[PDB]
Scaffold this active site. Sequence first.
Site, PDB file in Angstrom:
ATOM      1  N   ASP A 275      60.829  48.465  15.140  1.00 37.63           N
ATOM      2  CA  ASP A 275      59.746  48.982  14.315  1.00 37.63           C
ATOM      3  C   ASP A 275      60.136  49.018  12.847  1.00 37.63           C
ATOM      4  O   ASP A 275      60.821  49.939  12.406  1.00 37.63           O
ATOM      5  CB  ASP A 275      59.396  50.389  14.795  1.00 37.63           C
ATOM      6  CG  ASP A 275      58.280  51.021  14.001  1.00 37.63           C
ATOM      7  OD1 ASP A 275      57.603  50.287  13.260  1.00 37.63           O
ATOM      8  OD2 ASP A 275      58.073  52.245  14.150  1.00 37.63           O
TER       9      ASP A 275
ATOM     10  N   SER B  42      50.180  41.646  -1.225  1.00 38.01           N
ATOM     11  CA  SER B  42      49.573  40.362  -0.956  1.00 38.01           C
ATOM     12  C   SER B  42      48.678  39.976  -2.122  1.00 38.01           C
ATOM     13  O   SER B  42      48.072  40.827  -2.771  1.00 38.01           O
ATOM     14  CB  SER B  42      48.759  40.447   0.334  1.00 38.01           C
ATOM     15  OG  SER B  42      48.007  39.271   0.581  1.00 38.01           O
TER      16      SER B  42
END
EC number: 3.4.23.22
Length: 330
Positions: free
Chosen positions: A35, A199
């Site tokens: 994770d 992004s």
Amino acid sequence: STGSATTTPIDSLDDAYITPVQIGTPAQTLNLDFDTGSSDLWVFSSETTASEVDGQTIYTPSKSTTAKLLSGATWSISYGDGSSSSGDVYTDTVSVGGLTVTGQAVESAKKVSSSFTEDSTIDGLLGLAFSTLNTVSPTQQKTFFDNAKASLDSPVFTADLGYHAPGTYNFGFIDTTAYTGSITYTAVSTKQGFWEWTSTGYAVGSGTFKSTSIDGIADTGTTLLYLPATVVSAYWAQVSGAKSSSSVGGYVFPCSATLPSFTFGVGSARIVIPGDYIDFGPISTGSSSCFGGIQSSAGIGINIFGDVALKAAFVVFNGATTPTLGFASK
């Protein structure tokens, strides 16, 4: 040193991925959920409340000659999906894919929430976010990666998750045969303890690319792609009959649909998520309403590039002095 381990979807939907991890001496192999959005290595154990264990493999520290109780240390964690666990702490030898760390903090669960009990395939979590998020008290502990880092050939790990198929976590090297083209690197903020990046935009299907900054986290422990409501609405508007359902808890779509791809930007590069990666199947057994793999982050408070996005890429988690993230197509 290096390590390389195969990671395998837990079910037919890729709801999560498990990777075998050797703990203790002799080795006890547990299948952990790696994770990159948390920083605790915790396991089901011989200390876990018996009624809260249902099929998991447990770590028994009393059977490990290298286990040592970390005196006075406890841990307690809550995850974004409302699940939680807590317990005490041992140090022990931990190996992943041939890479060994001695003295790793292994957090032994005394209690786990129902969602963990109900998932027989996940024996615990191995956190790969920054150690500043580790919950051990009163002395915070380091992640497996942080402990291994100085010994690694290069201070990196990579995630290469498969779509409905196994994939690979590598530590200490970049497998140049595992991706196509080049890896595009992008800046990381560690301010919130995550692999947080921005992004450069998105496209839906064959549509034009929208240049827009989307701050979010690369999170292998989250199943879906969680993005701003504007982006998510633009995606589902291209699927006839798709709608947001408060009763179900997100966007659903007719199972008869053909889903468009979703592209996200990494600098000037583009990662294309095929439409099929966005299908999470019937909302309940036998239903013709299917659950979407792109969902709104509104009210999460952060955008999450979870498995839906990451499995479309070869992803480098670069733990150099100034960390960065790399993405390649594959």
